[PDB]
Design a binder for this molecule. Structure first.
Ligand SMILES: Nc1ncnc2c1ncn2[C@@H]1O[C@H](COP(=O)(O)OP(=O)(O)OP(O)(O)=S)[C@@H](O)[C@H]1O
Ligand SMILES: *CC(=O)Nc1nn(Cc2ccc(F)cc2)c2ccccc12
Ligand SMILES: [Zn+2]
Length: 406
């Protein structure tokens, strides 16, 4: 494996602020830049998946195409890029003609587009590659599904020289093969970023049948006022449970924001941004709240109800402690929550992924009932080459998990 040169490291520091590339980030970046190779990267939350597709077009001064149906989330990525002096935009049906002319003139490094727009404008994409050059096409599977990827199968046929970086939130081997055939990838480099988040203390406790009684141990009294220790996310299995929990917390005059897909994108965006600006201390959310939170100091994550499955749990708690400081992740559960989760696993159309999720769910109930190290149970899914000294140094201590405490 080759090392990045001074031009490469200086570009990383100037436009991204990082002094070094993480091992898997450099494997993906180098393979796209030098070998023009398709990549499939199994991405664990918190690693740094964005640099894999944002950095290459910035370094070569060309276009990087980012595909996702989530337009609602593209503004924050575009706005963040423009703040780091990286020209970026959203390209769509409702975009002005002057933005499209500026894309054709090579004024934008990162162009965010939907799968739907791609399908209807393949000729524009071919013109863009011939005249300007497309460094890469990035596709996040977590942002979508096979029906949305069916429109993207013509990408490798129309742009054979443009490498595709497909990012996925699951280690499922059948999903990996589905994304390879859906996008017609050619000899893709397969990488994975599974890692321990050692600054996350883990704890599981049983629900008492009373919301305030369950959440009271997490609250501190600052002079006379009840509040959380720091920025907190409470995950609920339903929109109705987010409303119940919020209503109870507001009886204590706690600074809250509810977040779920029943609220408009405008109301949701408002809650998210109030959390980032620290105007609200707690966000009570369904799993709809998670992607691109852009909050480094989440101190506490509470799953108010058993998590759907072990893999989902691993990904959701990864939104805590992005600053590297001490954070806590608590699960509050009852055996009746498990009965409910089981029924929702039959509503998976891929029987190969449904069985994968069923093994992940069986691991979840074992994890919840266990007397063993929580971190050891989660890390038992990774190869030893990914478990480092920092993780071993934390396991067996008070800062690891409830079962490692005395
Ligand atoms: N080379 C790097 N050096 C240091 N930190 C990095 C590096 N690459 C990424 N990170 C950090 O890794 C964290 C996660 O970044 P990403 O995974 O790209 O975030 P994201 O794409 O917004 O994903 P979500 O939606 O928040 S999971 C951030 O704190 C990054 O700044
Ligand atoms: C190589 C690699 O990172 N593998 C990987 N395996 N999983 C599955 C998993 C399930 C539950 C859990 F607690 C941890 C891991 C994942 C998930 C996410 C990213 C990578 C991987
Ligand atoms: Zn432990």
């Amino acid at each position: 494996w080759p090392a990045p040169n001074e031009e490469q490291v200086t570009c990383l520091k100037m436009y991204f602020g990082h002094s070094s590339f993480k091992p898997v980030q450099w494997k993906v970046i180098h393979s796209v830049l030098e070998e023009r190779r398709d990549n499939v990267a199994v991405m664990a939350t918190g690693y740094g998946k964005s640099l894999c597709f944002q950095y290459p077009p910035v370094y070569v001064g060309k276009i990087g195409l980012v595909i996702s149906p989530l337009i609602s989330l593209m503004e924050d990525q575009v706005l963040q890029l423009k703040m780091s002096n990286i020209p970026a935009c959203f390209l769509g049906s409702a975009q002005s003609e002057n933005v499209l002319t500026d894309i054709k003139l090579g004024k934008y490094r990162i162009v965010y587009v939907t799968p739907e727009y791609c399908s209807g404008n393949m000729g524009l994409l071919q013109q863009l590659e011939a005249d300007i050059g497309i460094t890469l096409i990035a596709v996040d599977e977590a942002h979508c599904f096979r029906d949305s990827f069916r429109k993207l199968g013509s990408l490798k046929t129309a742009l054979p020289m443009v490498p595709i970086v497909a990012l996925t939130a699951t280690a499922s081997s059948s999903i990996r093969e589905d994304i390879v055939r859906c996008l017609n990838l050619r000899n893709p480099q397969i990488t994975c970023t599974g890692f321990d988040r050692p600054n996350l203390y883990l704890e599981v406790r049983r629900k008492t049948g009373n919301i305030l009684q369950d959440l009271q141990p997490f609250l501190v009294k600052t002079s006379s006022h009840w509040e959380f220790e720091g920025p907190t996310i409470i995950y609920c299995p339903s929109r109705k449970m987010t409303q119940q929990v919020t209503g109870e917390l507001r009886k204590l005059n706690l600074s809250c924001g509810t977040y779920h897909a029943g609220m408009s994108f405008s109301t949701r965006k408002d809650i998210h941004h109030r959390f980032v600006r620290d105007e609200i201390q707690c966000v009570i959310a369904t799993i709809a709240f998670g992607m691109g939170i852009n909050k480094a100091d989440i101190r506490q994550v509470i799953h108010y109800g058993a998590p759907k499955d072990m893999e989902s749990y691993y990904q959701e708690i990864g939104r805590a402690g992005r600053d590297g400081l001490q954070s806590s992740c608590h699960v509050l559960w009852a055996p009746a929550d498990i009965n409910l989760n089981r029924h929702l696993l039959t509503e998976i159309r891929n029987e190969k992924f449904r069985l994968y999720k069923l093994k992940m769910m069986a691991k979840m109930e074992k994890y919840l009932h266990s007397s063993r190290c929580r971190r050891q149970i989660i890390l038992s899914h990774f190869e030893d080459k990914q478990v480092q000294k920092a993780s071993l140094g934390i396991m067996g201590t008070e800062k690891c998990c409830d079962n490692c405490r005395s």
